[PDB]
Symmetry: C3
Subunit: 155 residues, 3 copies
């Protein structure tokens, strides 16, 4: 079994809604990014790639490469997941922590778990997401952006 | 074995002392929270619940529910731990990292390990806490508040 | 198998270059620290010590003790690693995440993996490093300093 850690941040920008863990969540402002900027998933992806010892989402799916523009992060995830399985690993489980002041991630979480467990091809019981604010402190607390951490266990 | 990640933050406020990992630590300012605002423990709790795939402390013990007011976080911990054991898991080990500029967590750490290992019902050797500042950088570095991360392994 | 989490931050200061994961990386400003201030490694070290349940780099190699001045963090690492092996543990694998806006960690990463895998005495396949910025947000995003997280699995 191997461990892995991930982390991503994205600045709010423009109109909403935002995409987190696959769910289109309505919010005043949106998020700025080359891809769909789904922080929850990018975080999960790195943690997954990290366990696989394949580096990070950045070595694999460049900001520069235009094809990755508006890119559905779930695709990136599924691919990084493919390559991981090829390296002969299998999902132990993943845990994602969304550090955001807003919007309210809570109600969307189950749907996220559905999307993530699908992409990874596991049971929801192997995919856990949770959320938390930084109590008005920090860029996250100021509403400047969303951050997200994630850890994962591969076999 | 399953992994889990947690993270909490609390703004300083009012008179001290503060409570971290169960220890009443003297400090000029205190911490603002619905419960006792023990960051070290909330962080541990989420990480524990995350491994159990039970979500987070928020789905289980609401800011809104008044009973959780001034609430001894160790209780919340012990309960989240109970439910976890019921799901058939057992403590692999936990690691907590306190990111605070002040007060000096160091001298209180052993007592924390005592409290945490009790609550979890393991040996201190399965509970590790450590501390670090952000070098005057950030809300933590500015003394605006304390943050704390934690990871855990369940079986 | 045991888990472990680490985290460090260092303020930029003076002339470059900086040292991360062992690599001397050229950059305008440098980093302020009692030791060489290699964040990547300190982060790895704590995570390693955390899994071993030996506490943190701070309980073992003091800012105050002058010998640790300008100290090659790899030494600190190798020692913390020694003591860990003595406690009867062996490297499962480690994952390091550098949260820095600049300089570009990417090209130096392989050399880092070489240094880290040497120090730990494992194969590069057990040492993974990755990098990420906070999108101009935060002290890291403002270029005020570098932060770094790391997780580790011991056996
Ligand atoms: C998948 C993409 C493109 O579609 O998504 P978006 O960022 O557009 O949302 C990106 O490649 C996802 O980029 P991400 O890795 O999560 O955050 P970035 O700040 O863009 O990091 C880009 C790359 O630069 C490297 N890097 C990062 C920070 C730093 N100080 N030094 C570095 O060398 C890292 O190896 C990383 O892979
Ligand atoms: C145990 C309690 C109550 O006694 O402690 P205190 O916060 O008062 O200290 C709280 O429930 C402990 O709250 P905590 O989860 O650690 O931090 P909060 O910022 O209050 O998050 C509350 C809940 O809202 C959800 N949430 C959080 C942030 C966000 N952007 N969107 C969300 O949907 C999360 O699912 C979380 O469970
Ligand atoms: C290895 C050394 C010395 O050569 O490196 P440098 O910091 O000079 O680079 C230090 O001991 C590496 O210090 P580090 O632990 O990573 O960050 P620091 O902010 O200096 O934390 C110092 C110690 O104080 C304790 N501590 C920290 C923060 C806090 N709020 N309360 C505490 O009690 C921790 O137990 C930690 O071990």
């Amino acid at each position: 079994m191997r461990i892995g850690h991930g982390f991503d941040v994205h600045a709010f920008g423009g109109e909403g809604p935002i995409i987190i863990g696959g769910v289109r969540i309505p919010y005043e402002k949106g998020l700025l990014a080359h891809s769909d900027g789904d922080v929850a998933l990018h975080a999960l992806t790195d943690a997954l790639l990290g366990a696989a010892a394949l580096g990070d989402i950045g070595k694999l799916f460049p900001d520069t490469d235009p094809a990755f523009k508006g890119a559905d992060s779930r695709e990136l995830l599924r691919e990084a997941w493919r390559r991981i399985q090829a390296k002969g690993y299998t999902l132990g489980n993943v845990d994602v922590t969304i550090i955001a002041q807003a919007p309210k991630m809570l109600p969307h979480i189950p749907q996220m778990r559905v999307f993530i467990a699908e992409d990874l091809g596991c049971h929801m019981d192997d995919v856990n997401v949770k959320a938390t604010t930084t109590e008005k402190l920090g860029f996250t607390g100021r509403g400047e952006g969303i951050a997200c951490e994630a850890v994962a266990l591969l076999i």
